[PDB]
Amino acid sequence: ITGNDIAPSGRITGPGMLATGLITGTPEFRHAARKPELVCAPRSDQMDRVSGEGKERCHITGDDWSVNKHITGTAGQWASGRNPSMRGNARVVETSAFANRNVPKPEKPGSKITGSSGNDTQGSLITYSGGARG
Amino acid sequence: QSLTCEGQIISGTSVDASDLVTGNEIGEQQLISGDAYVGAQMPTDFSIQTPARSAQNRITGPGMLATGLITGTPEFR
Amino acid sequence: MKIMQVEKTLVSTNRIADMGHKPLLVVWEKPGAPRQVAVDAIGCIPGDWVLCVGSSAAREAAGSKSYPSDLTIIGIIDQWN
Amino acid sequence: GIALGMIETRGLVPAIEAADAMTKAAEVRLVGRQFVGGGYVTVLVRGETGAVNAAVRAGADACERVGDGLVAAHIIARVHSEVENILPKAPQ
Amino acid sequence: GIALGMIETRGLVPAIEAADAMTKAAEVRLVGRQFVGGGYVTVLVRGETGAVNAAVRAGADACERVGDGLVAAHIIARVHSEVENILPKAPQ
Amino acid sequence: GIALGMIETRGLVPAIEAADAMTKAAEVRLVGRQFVGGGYVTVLVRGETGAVNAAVRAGADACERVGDGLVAAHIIARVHSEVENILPKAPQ
Amino acid sequence: GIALGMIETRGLVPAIEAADAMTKAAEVRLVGRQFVGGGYVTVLVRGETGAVNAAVRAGADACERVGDGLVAAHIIARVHSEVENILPKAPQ
Amino acid sequence: GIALGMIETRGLVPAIEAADAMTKAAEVRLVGRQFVGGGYVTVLVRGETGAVNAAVRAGADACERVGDGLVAAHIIARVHSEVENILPKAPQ
Amino acid sequence: GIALGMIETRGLVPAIEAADAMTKAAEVRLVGRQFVGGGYVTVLVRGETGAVNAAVRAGADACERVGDGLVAAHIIARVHSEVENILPKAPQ
Amino acid sequence: GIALGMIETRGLVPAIEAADAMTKAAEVRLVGRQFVGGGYVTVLVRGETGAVNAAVRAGADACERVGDGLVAAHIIARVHSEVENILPKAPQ
Amino acid sequence: GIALGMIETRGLVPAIEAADAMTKAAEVRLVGRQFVGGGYVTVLVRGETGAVNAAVRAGADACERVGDGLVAAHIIARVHSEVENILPKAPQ
Amino acid sequence: GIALGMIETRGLVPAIEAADAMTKAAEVRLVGRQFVGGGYVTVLVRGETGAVNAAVRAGADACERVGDGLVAAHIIARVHSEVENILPKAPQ
Amino acid sequence: GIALGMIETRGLVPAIEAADAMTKAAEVRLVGRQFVGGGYVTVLVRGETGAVNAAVRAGADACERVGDGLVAAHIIARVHSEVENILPKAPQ
Amino acid sequence: GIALGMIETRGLVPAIEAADAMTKAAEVRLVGRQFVGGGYVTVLVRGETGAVNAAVRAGADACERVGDGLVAAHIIARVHSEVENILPKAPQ
Amino acid sequence: GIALGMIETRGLVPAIEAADAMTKAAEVRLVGRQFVGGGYVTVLVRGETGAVNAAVRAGADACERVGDGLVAAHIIARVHSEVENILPKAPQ
Amino acid sequence: GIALGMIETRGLVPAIEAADAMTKAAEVRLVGRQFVGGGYVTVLVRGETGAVNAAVRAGADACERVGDGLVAAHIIARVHSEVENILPKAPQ
Amino acid sequence: GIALGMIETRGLVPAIEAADAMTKAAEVRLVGRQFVGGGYVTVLVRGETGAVNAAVRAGADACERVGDGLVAAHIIARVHSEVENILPKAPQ
Amino acid sequence: GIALGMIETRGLVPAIEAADAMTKAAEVRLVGRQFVGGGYVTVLVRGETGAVNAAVRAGADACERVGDGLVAAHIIARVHSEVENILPKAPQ
Amino acid sequence: GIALGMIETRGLVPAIEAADAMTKAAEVRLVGRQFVGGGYVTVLVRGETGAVNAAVRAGADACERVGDGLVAAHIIARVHSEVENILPKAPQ
Amino acid sequence: GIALGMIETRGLVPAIEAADAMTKAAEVRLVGRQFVGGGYVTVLVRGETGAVNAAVRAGADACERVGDGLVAAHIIARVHSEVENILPKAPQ
Amino acid sequence: GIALGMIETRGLVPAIEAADAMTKAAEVRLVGRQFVGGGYVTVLVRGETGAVNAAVRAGADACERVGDGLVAAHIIARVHSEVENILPKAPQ
């Protein structure tokens, strides 16, 4: 075949340049004839940076608000580098209920009371006035 | 002196052929079978060869000619 | 066991977690009799004369012996008068 | 009798010999002779079952070695009504 | 009957036992016996498909050894309307 | 006469030579020529037993060489009354 | 249709099966069956050439294992006017 | 045209390629396109026996590598009269 | 007849080859075709119990190789009145 | 009666045999056959629970080896009034 | 009742069993049954949140062994107004 | 002319060549052409004993190399009166 | 709103839950649900690009664990005027 | 013309092709077709000597590979009046 | 234009993205969206041969990794008039 | 019919033999002869698809060795309506 | 005289020598001369089959040496009616 | 139509074949066929630049093996106004 | 002058030299000059047989050297009346 | 202008490319194209001396590759009055 | 004058150029340009004998390498009156 060519090559880039191997019925094909299991990442494995809407664990595809590394701005250096700051080493001691879940608690002597004592050893968590268990 | 085919001496008037009688000696042929009239003097297949049977007892048409010469609309194979 | 009519379909969304969720059917010794209740192991429609087993028999009648049932429905009388 | 006897042969000379032998031995009636074509000639002889069996044995031996030999020797003690049509009822 | 059962045997003696066995075994009407020529006889039957299948099986088994054997045994459950013409309407 | 002298040959030309030699030799009467099929042509003569023996031997010798040849040559000193029903009565 | 397709078989049973296979397979008309003799039996069909090719191929495969087998299968895309006088014709 | 070419494919894209190829190859009409279900689409053509044979092969070759591809390719040179009722007449 | 034969096949193309060989082979009539869904096309033919049997073995051999293959083949000697409602009365 | 006999199978051929067996075994009225889609075909009968229990056991055994197989077979003694709205009343 | 219970299943027998278990367990209106395609059948209920929770939990266990299992069992306490458009109102 | 000359052959082509050479060579009338069967054809001429002697010799050389060939060639100056009955008077 | 949000799922129950979350999470309108077939159900929302992004993400996490799951979650910030036709305008 | 061109073949099928190529190739009338017997079939043409020679050579080559084959291909320029009787005057 | 472009996909979500990339990439009109079944959705576009080629390539790339994905992406520069009867003229 | 047969040759003597063989062999009409130039001469035989293939096959063998020979033999079962203009409609 | 004898030559001079020889040595009329182009000239003479053979051997010998010489010499014994249209009728 | 697509070939068979493959492949009108002399035949097809490129490429491959192959296959996107004078407007 | 004299040459310049040399050597008329094609030009002169032999010999020698050369130089002393109709009467 | 630019090229496809390139890449005008015969086709342009030189070189390089290719490319800056008679002169 | 100089050339570019050289060089009148076919093109000039000799030498030297070349260059100083008829009086 000679003359003006509409056949696809790299220098003349555009729509004709893409999807070679998926397209069929093209004058080139006729001459020749003659992934991830789940859309969304494992829930346990990934803790999302911004939670709720803005979660990135689900691979929403096409015209989504995600910006790739090549796109720059409104995040990272553009937000963090704006204000000068210095983090200081502070002795971090927390006095709170969660922190005191494991405080050393003294040995608890049980109840040696007998007779019509509704006390159950399973229910010894209770303490009576004077600090007396049961 | 005459005998039957199975070995029976037949002792009387003999119609068996003789050297001195000439008209009688037209056949000394075992080919005569069935009832036995003269003395000492398995078939298993057709003996004629009908021609259809002799010949060992795919399509021939206009379409079987020009095997490589023809090019064209391909027909189902 | 006893023949008891079904009056309605009892619903409790704050029942013990040990019950899982079997169907529940208010049962009648007869209309005008105490509205006792059964774990409906054998499916029964309201307005159905249904035999109900009781005691530890009702418990293994449902999934497990540890299952919390005092009355279970173990059938529907085919024809009842 | 209702039994049938049959001696197919390769020729009319073996068939006629077999027919003579069959009729002369036992109380059987030649019911006819059919030219099959291809050289085969069948003789159908009817009678009491014991008589037909004796006649067929005699028929087969008489024509076994005459002309071209014997092809078939069969005895049917009773044939069906439908078979009667293909059989030659009367000798001819 | 629509189903056609056909047993061809070399000789008429193997085709009279084939037909005796065929008719007796099942309810089939023997439509014709045809001397093809060269020693071939074709017994044809028409009947219900179940009867024809049982019949031809019986006839083929009986004539395999009688005289010369069976060239063929075949069952055509509904011969085309065009083929009805060549099939014999009654035995002669 | 009652005896039957038969001579089956592989072709009508051998059969006619055989018939010519048989009717000339003895006092036998040609009773008919039967086309068996497949090339077999039987020639039947009927006369006194001694004449039939003379005719059969004379006919066998004459037509043995002629054409394909002679399949059979038979003499039946007496034919049973039943066999005479399948026998050709006479050419006329 | 003018084209003619003919299947020749040794025996009537392969021919009838051939004629059943040829007529059912494509738009061909069984004109008639001819008993050639010696066993040969030719079933002739007439119709459009492409249909005849589909029919003669179908009928050959159908009767090839049936009976003795196939002698010849053939197609003539046009039959001369003189030939039709010798063709069975008489589809009726 | 009675011959029923029928090219089943997986999808409507292999079926519209095959249909284009079949209609172009020879004088056949696209009698009907049927959605079987389970993602099977069967295009049926009806034409003369030769035109259907050529069309089916062209459709089989054209769409064998288009989409999922070819499930079946069949030619019925003459469908039975009872079968004709279920077959489509004009594409809907 | 009142017997019911059925041949389910994956795809319409196998269902029509099966339906064309069922009606051609034996004395059965297509009573209807239903698209089951999921790619299955059940064919139904009703006739004499022997004919429906012969139709469903012939049909099963026909479409086992065509298309995806044969999901089912079945015969119901006699169909109860209640089930006849779900069966197709006639394509006509 | 009010009990529902349900049999789901993978094709119409396994369901019809199941429904033949269910209606034949006990006095259960076929109230409809649904096409679930995906190849699943369900049959429903409405009769007294004794009749539904006897019928379903028969149908599940009848279609167990027929076709692809049986997916489900269930008996509901009393179908709630609300569910009756999603049950076919008569076969379509 | 605003809350929407649902129980998707692989087939109609599992779905009908689930629906019978859902409507019997709690006071819930079976708004519709949907054939989703590819073998999926979704029975939906609308009732009080407590009643819906009791129903869908009861239906899930009952149909979990009925053939193919439950694809899903979902309880929605409050349904948005936009969603109500696609939700069925009365069974069809 | 009572002398009879007969040339048997394997086919009509050799027989017609022989008859042509026999009737051309001498003044002998073609009294008959008899189809013996099994491929044998006999041509008979009746004339003066000298004319028949010359005719059969010419025919013998003519058909020996034509087709399958000459089975036999015979000359009889006179035939017996009984044998004349079996001879064909006129060519049919 | 012009942006189109899609969440394909396997079955109606995951789709309804997905649509429940998508409409609740952001101010998007459910333009319809389409039963694709093969057990796929698509929920479509049209709204602002920012809002649809929130709805698609909210629906994708909700329906992932509900039922078989989500095939895909997609957004088209600007739909061409030509795509509009195949998009359903409103379920009700 | 008066010249006679004969082709004997083994079977009817080789004779119809031999006859088809004789009357197509050259200007020769087809005077008749004869079944010799033994599976031999002659084809006789009458025309001018030049036409018959070209016709007999075309016919011979056409039937050599059709079926069992060609036995004879003979040309007689002049046929005596005695031989005209045995020749078929008009095709049958 | 008359050229036809066609992107088959597994699901409506992959097909809407393919439909949006095709219409936006080139001067093509989306003539219809067809639910094949088995979860396949074919989006057909029409337009100039050059434009349709540009649209299909861009549409295939966009939907290659959307949902289950692309099954086919084909171009037919000219479709026969008969195939145009199975093509949807305008979408719904 | 609309099939086109074509036989180009290196001369007119090989194109007239080709034309005779093509028209004689099958039912195809000789639409035209075109002197291309360079000594090439083309004979066209429009007819049915089965007939045209056979005609172009007969033409090919007859004139392959006539003169220089056959440059081309080509079958088109369907020629586009546009090509019909350049095609010769009647012979000159 | 429907036979046609064509002698092709590389030039007009050998053709006129060939036409002079062909018309001088047989009763063959000269039906015209054709300029094929590329130098080939075809001289066609139509007469009896024998005369045409005599004319074309005489013509071939005469022009085998003159000029570039004989390209082709062919004898067509009968010319189909369709071919006569492209043949030169007659200069007279 | 504007773009000229020209396929030159050696002969009118390669060119008619190429012309059928050009007009079939894409929306192009056959504006004429020119006999260039010397055995060269040109087929010019005017249509949109994309259609012409598809048509010429399809024609090139189709006619390469047909007889003597293509000499040229040039695609001109837009011929100059002056060149249009020498281009054929319509075929003759 | 009945005698004709032709001198084909490979070109018009050799032919005109030959014509000048021929009509100058002897009293012959230039009846015609034909363009055979492929570069061949013929020059014919009709004259007394002596004047034609002398003219042709002189013309051959003169134009043998001229240009591409001399193809043939042939003298016919008497042309048949049929050959005269293909001869040019007056030059053009 | 007066200058002339001729491009002889084997075939009409190279000639049309050359004409297009000559008329587009210069101010020349296409006076005409003359099929020389024998395969050659000349395209002549008349214009100014500078334009003709550019036209010929552009036309020569463009088509040298197309088809068989360039035979000659010549510029005649001035053509004598006598040589303007055997030119195309007016384009139209 | 009447001297005829003639330069034959392979192609028309070497002739239209030899004509320019011949008419420019000497006082000769271009009388014609004849297409001989085969590629040859003879350009004739008529003038005084001395001028024609100068012109032809000029034409010959000019066209030797301009193209495929020059076939001939001949000068005839006087031309016979008979030759005048074939010579072109004025150019075209």
Author numbering:
A (entry chain Y): 702 to 735, 770 to 869
B (entry chain X): 607 to 647, 685 to 700, 712 to 731
C (entry chain U): 1 to 81
D (entry chain R), E (entry chain Q), F (entry chain O), G (entry chain S), H (entry chain N), I (entry chain I), ...: 6 to 97
Give excerpts from the publication:
The cryo-EM structures of T = 9, T = 9 Q = 12, T = 13, T = 16, and T = 19 shell assemblies were determined at 2.3-, 2.99-, 2.93-, 2.75-, and 3.04-Å resolution, respectively. The resulting shell structures show various sizes, with a maximal size of 54 nm, representing the largest synthetic icosahedral BMC shells to date that are suitable for in-depth structural analysis. The T = 9 shell has a minimum of four different interfaces, whereas the T = 19 shell has a maximum of 10 different interfaces. Notably, structural analysis of the large T = 19 shell revealed the highest number of CsoS2-C fragments and additional binding details. The five fragments cover a substantial portion of entire CsoS2-C (Ser604-Gly869). F3 and F4 belong to the same region of CsoS2-C (Ile702-Arg735). Closer inspection revealed that F3 has a sequence overlap with F4, although their conformations differ. Nevertheless, our results indicate that CsoS2-C adopts at least two distinct conformations for interacting with the shell. Intriguingly, the smaller T = 9 shells involved only one conformation of CsoS2-C, whereas the second conformation of CsoS2 appeared in the larger T = 13, T = 16, and T = 19 shells.
Among diverse BMCs, carboxysomes are specific CO2-fixing BMCs found in all cyanobacteria and many proteobacteria. The carboxysome uses a polyhedral protein shell to encapsulate the key CO2 fixation enzymes, ribulose-1,5-bisphosphate carboxylase/oxygenase (Rubisco) and carbonic anhydrase (CA). Carboxysome shells are typically composed of three groups of structural components that form hexamers, pentamers, and trimers. Here, we generated recombinant α-carboxysome shells of Halothiobacillus neapolitanus by expressing all the shell proteins (involving three CsoS1 hexameric proteins and two CsoS4 pentameric proteins), together with the C-terminal domain of CsoS2 (CsoS2-C) that mediates shell assembly.
